[PDB]
Amino acid sequence: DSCIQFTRHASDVLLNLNRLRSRDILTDVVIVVSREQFRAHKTVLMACSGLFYSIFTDQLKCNLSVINLDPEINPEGFCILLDFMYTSRLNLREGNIMAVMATAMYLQMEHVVDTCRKFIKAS
Amino acid sequence: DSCIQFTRHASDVLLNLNRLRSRDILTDVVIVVSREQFRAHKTVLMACSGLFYSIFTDQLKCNLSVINLDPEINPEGFCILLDFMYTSRLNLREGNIMAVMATAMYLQMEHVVDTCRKFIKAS
């Protein structure tokens, strides 16, 4: 086509979606990780995760307001990944990298799994 | 912070949200423009437009599944802008620039209004 493109549009959209999350605006699901609860937007979860994409395209699970993750999933690892989904920023540290990689593999977030594998290989 | 960043994350998120729109997955509103109907995600509309941001933060309008725009709004201008919201790409042409600018002013999409003003000034 003959379209023009606004370079910062995608980043600005994601920044606004994170603002809606922080104010709990139009969140439509709660992700339960052991004792911890995380509110989010199903569309953003699907856009970032192969696991959530599969869950919310299911004709029955698409209508659930609560999703319980596998009890092996660490709440901190999930929190770091949920923050990454809404910001493009990953808080990867020596003390959390194993829990982050395991959570990213479960959530099917290929690019996060790739950087965790590379950072582990370096050490 | 000490975060790392994935450059393409925001663009990849927007691409997936457009894939959900194209398949009519988790769309939660229909925007009526004269005789024409457009299905979309309230969160994406809010993230792109000052008008939709105001509408869906309203304690009553947040729950509406149908929004009717002002009858002066041109369906083609709206379609071009809805496509821009989900792609960062604007189909700006000599034959549609006046309808696109008027629709962007109504929707409160400042960056689109700015490029339309600049393109009109050049001609």
């Binding site: 023009i4 493109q5 370079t7 | -």
Partner: peptide
Amino acid sequence: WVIP
């Protein structure tokens, strides 16, 4: 704005 750019030419993509």
